[PDB]
């Protein structure tokens, strides 16, 4: 069955240094075998994983400043950077990897973060 890629709002988020910043990644899953990855961009259009839900069990002890919570409505997720630093500003997105009935990855539209002084 066809499904639509996830949505990632807000499209732009500005926060002064020290505060928490929170995005919402919404995904309308067709099965229960899927993961959501939270990427931060590099200038080469290259994907860099920050965190994922459900948690990646292979590489533990990861940065506890980047968290992904699953809201109990069945489609919404909170990607939050706690105590954002200046260099935490950049381009962010989320991406759904379904594992059934067909393994397929679809990325969300990108969003920006600006941590200020």
């Amino acid at each position, epitope marked *: 069955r066809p499904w639509n890629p996830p949505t990632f709002s807000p499209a732009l988020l500005v926060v002064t240094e020290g505060d928490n910043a929170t995005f919402t990644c919404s995904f309308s899953n067709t*099965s*229960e*075998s899927f993961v959501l990855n939270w990427y931060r961009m590099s200038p080469s259009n290259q994907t860099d994983k920050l965190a994922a839900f*459900p*948690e990646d*069990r292979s*590489q533990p002890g990861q940065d506890c400043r980047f968290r992904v919570t699953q809201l109990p409505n069945g489609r919404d997720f909170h990607m939050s950077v706690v105590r954002a630093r200046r260099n935490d500003s950049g381009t962010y997105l989320c991406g759904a*990897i379904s*594992l059934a009935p067909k393994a*397929q990855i679809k990325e969300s539209l990108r969003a920006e973060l600006r941590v200020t002084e």
Partner: antibody, heavy 117, light 108 residues
């Protein structure tokens, strides 16, 4: 830290039943898929069943469909495989496993099930 | 049903020499392919996932490549501790299907 331990293997006569258990630890059990993969002695790997984290999606191949039933207990961090109407070609080591986006990343030790007169 | 065809089935390799195993899918599976090593008397162990990404803890001398229907596992310098059976597997569609196995033996 992910640990999977099988139980309930042994010898059974053709046509008999057998129930396999898989106790899990090291991760939030209810958020990940659980699977059974078997291997006949001296042969290759064959996927037997998969169950979603919530437990509402189960997947079987045609070779065991209608005989084997994969089930889980999320409150008890354990997985089960009910094997009815066993034939001689079901004789194999049964590994419980937990697949994610990285494939079948976690395997148990495997328990031997022998079907013979 | 998707058929993973491995080649070869036996691979005699001298220590230090590179080894490479080919796996060909009966239909397009994109890059949803994993490689496992199973040492005799042990459970399978994941080496490569998503056709090319190394699993946590896998030495850098293991690498994976390929897309569509053609995939390749490469061991740049074969150590003695790489002996075992190597499996390729697609997890794009159910049923998940493995290769028949590739037995890596040391040439001496």
């Amino acid at each position: 830290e992910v640990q999977l331990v099988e139980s309930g293997g042994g010898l059974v006569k053709p046509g008999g039943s057998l129930r396999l258990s898989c106790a899990a630890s090291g991760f939030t059990f209810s958020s990940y898929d659980m699977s059974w993969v078997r291997q006949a002695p001296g042969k290759g790997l064959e996927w037997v069943a998969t169950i979603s984290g919530g437990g509402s999606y189960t997947y079987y191949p045609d070779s065991v469909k209608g005989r084997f039933t994969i089930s889980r207990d999320n409150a008890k961090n354990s997985l089960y495989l009910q094997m009815n109407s066993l034939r001689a070609e079901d004789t194999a080591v049964y590994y419980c496993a937990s697949p994610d986006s990285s494939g079948v990343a976690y395997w148990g030790q495997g328990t031997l099930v022998t079907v013979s007169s | 049903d998707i058929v993973m065809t491995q080649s070869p089935l036996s691979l005699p390799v001298t220590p230090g020499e590179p080894a490479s195993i080919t796996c060909k899918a009966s239909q397009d599976v994109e890059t949803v392919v994993a490689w496992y090593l199973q040492k005799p008397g042990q459970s399978p162990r994941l080496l490569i996932y998503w056709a090319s990404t190394r699993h946590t803890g896998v030495p850098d001398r293991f690498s994976g490549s390929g897309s569509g229907t053609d995939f390749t596992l490469k061991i740049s310098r074969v150590e003695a501790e790489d002996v075992g059976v190597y499996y390729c597997q697609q997890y794009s569609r159910y049923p998940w299907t493995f290769g028949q196995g590739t037995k890596l033996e040391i040439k001496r």
